[PDB]
């Protein structure tokens, strides 16, 4: 007593928009550092009937029965996860049930410190995430600033983690957890140095490696598992999995942490796990362990280095003057334009990027930079030689943005009016669409 | 630069378990009240590339661009949701971004009352949900008892909502929100009477209709939208959508509640939405509005009443002695066996049900009932005539549980040891599999 007909027939309206979205994705240079493209195998898992199943609890400890095949899945996932992050099932556990990055951070932080607990994270404007305790003046923007009491460290005017001010704030504030690993940070992290600070104050060490997860797994960047009490990561970014998150906890360093994490997740915050997510994560983590994926992650870095260099060769300033990873932040002051405008300009030419604040930006109102990343384009088969074109396209957009601001003024509402019809952008869009459209596409 | 080969080829290990799980679902009488089976179109949407997209924010108000086809999807979903629940976009708004029911309740409750705020909900043992403020003595089990201050009302010894005790409690406690709509409640709800109580104390009316959502959409049961400030529902249960949740808010009664709900969701709790969930909800909501779905929901009710009647004709007791909805709770005292045991016995015969407490149960240790529901079986084509067989299978299972408790004792560990190899269970399992395996299966 149901409808069997394909999505096409059952709902042609939705299939219209979905087919369109697919086409935009195919015909875009996607530089959103936090984006990637899933293969059909990860998407078969997301569309699998395994999500019919209520499975509150953990393997071998379910509230409901009929959960044998689900137990095997969740365990296959936890194993594949510990293997991928080169870490022993005797020193480290994983929780695979967090529905997304933000959920996973809220949960882990609660487990460690509880309500009213004291947390420290990098400010959003300096490259930290919302769930690292972000707040405005009096307005507690993130639950992590309201549920916990939080203080935000900044980067120095060069764009690097101000480790000294982290100390000067740590002793001042006496936190129970300090978070590192970031939303927009183009360099590697000194986990060791964060460990030093954390000991001095009896604090937990939280590493959110969501953006750099692959580097950590493939031993290309610093290992946080050597110093961290908890590591969290999303699975949809450089990891190239589904939209989901993982919580890692060092038991061999921390008393009953397995308990605190696993019950923060359920039943403190979540109910039924989404088993299709768990299935999809499992499938990707297998790929993650293959050396073919290490080949991919390397290519992500080589592309990022080549893009940084080529942008610099066109006299474009980069925050920290380069990259250690997948992510670049362009400082635009030199051209007297906002990241706000440049985003709008790149939208018109099917180039996906987003505005990003720079150290000298006081407010978050009109950021002077943009964040770009290479994982999605690397997935589509772009190599170093291809980074010059992307760099050139970006430089053309920067210049156009300069011209269009000279005609229509500084206020963004006005600027946007200059975008449609512009002969140049229409020509630049087609170059993009033609090169982007014909790239490998999972 | 990716692996394109089907899940079958790329990962044979996972495909095995998934095919197994699928076979288990086909060969099971699934009586889990909160479970259903999604059609192929809902699963195509869950497996769609729309989840490659970061879409933090709301339609026309995103942080990143390239979000035009996402915006159309989220709006097509919000529309279809208001339509389905027979409510106008001028009095009521929706948020379609909560990842699951628990997140949705935590989010809605914070939006209304904030940290340290006061909430009333039905106790779990009485039929309430974890996110309705659940706690043990000193042990804040659910975040909803920790980040809020919560007090729990019970049901009377007949199994009904003790509206009088709710008053006795509302005046003593003075909460900012009272929750109704339940995990395990076999009767309709007096929303009007909850409204009256909330007025007397200046509290919000929160209705979680996750279990009965379809009934409310098809004007088959009482309408909470008439009296409630906030209505939450999951989409994976009787609604028969994906694993996701909806938050409804009465703006034409409540100030800037549109803002308060929408920002509790993002950026307080969540980050990027899971657009594939949004897409899948959109698709199911279309189906929900069809009169064919009203037919299905009616059948759910008829089947449920037929099952209750048949159980009673075989001298089996039911809490409240019947049902108004999809859900029955069997009282087992009469037989001196637990729900815990019957669950285990029903597992052995591919009959999915879960244990459930009755009004006279002191603790959660060893509940004296089971909860069953009809949505899943109705989806698989079962009609009123078919309920007799299901009732008969349950009666035979109750009897076997009685015989096995007599042979192996009362402690559950010992009892389970009696299950494997039992000639009767193997015979009864086969009867189940034969009839279950050949039922329509989306
Ligand atoms: C470092 C970090 N950690 C967590 C998250 C949350 O992921 P969700 O699945 O969206 O909850 C993010 C998200 N980052 C976005 C911006 O918010 C991005 O585009 O980088 C993150 O960066
Ligand atoms: C009434 C009600 N509200 C919320 C939830 C939470 O849904 P999740 O999607 O699991 O977060 C439930 C869940 N119900 C389970 C038992 O907890 C069920 O089998 O009934 C719910 O009932
Ligand atoms: Cl999903």
Residue numbers in the entry:
A (entry chain B), B (entry chain A): 1 to 442
The authors write:
SHMT is a pyridoxal-5′-phosphate (PLP)-dependent enzyme that catalyzes the interconversion of l-serine (l-Ser) and tetrahydro­folate (THF) to glycine (Gly) and methylene tetrahydrofolate (MTHF). The enzyme provides activated one-carbon units for the synthesis of dTMP, choline and amino acids. Plasmodium serine hydroxymethyltransferase (SHMT) has recently been shown to be vital for parasite growth and development, making it a potential target for antimalarial drug development. The overall structure of PvSHMT was found to be very similar to that of PfSHMT, existing as a twofold symmetric homodimer with two catalytic sites.
The first was a crystal of the binary complex of PvSHMT with l-Ser, which diffracted to 2.5 Å resolution and was obtained in the presence of methotrexate (MTX), although there was no density for MTX in the final map. The structures of the PvSHMT–l-Ser and PvSHMT–d-Ser–5FTHF complexes were used to assess the amino-acid binding pocket. Key interactions with both d-Ser and l-Ser consist of two components: hydrogen bonds from the conserved residues in the PLP pocket (Ser100, Ser102, Thr183, Asp208, His129, His236, Tyr′54 and Gly′272) and the amino-acid pocket (Ser34, His211, Arg371, Glu′56 and Tyr′64). Although the stabilizing interactions are from identical residues, three major differences between d-Ser and l-Ser binding can be observed. Firstly, the salt-bridge interactions between the Arg371 side chain and the carboxyl group of d-Ser are distorted, at distances of 3.0 and 3.2 Å, while two ideal salt bridges at distances of 2.7 and 2.8 Å are observed to l-Ser. The d-Ser side chain is oriented away from N5 of THF and is found in the extended plane of the PLP ring, while the l-Ser side chain is perpendicular to N5. Differences in the accommodation of l-Ser and d-Ser in the PvSHMT active site may account for the broad substrate specificity of SHMT and the lower catalytic efficiency for d-Ser in the THF-dependent catalytic function. Nevertheless, these observations indicate that the overall amino-acid binding site of PvSHMT is sufficiently plastic to accommodate both the d- and l-isomers of the substrate. The crystal structures of complexes of PvSHMT with l-Ser and d-Ser–(6R)-5FTHF revealed that the arrangement of the residues in the amino-acid binding pocket is restricted by the configuration of the bound amino-acid substrate, leading to different catalytic efficiencies towards each substrate isomer.
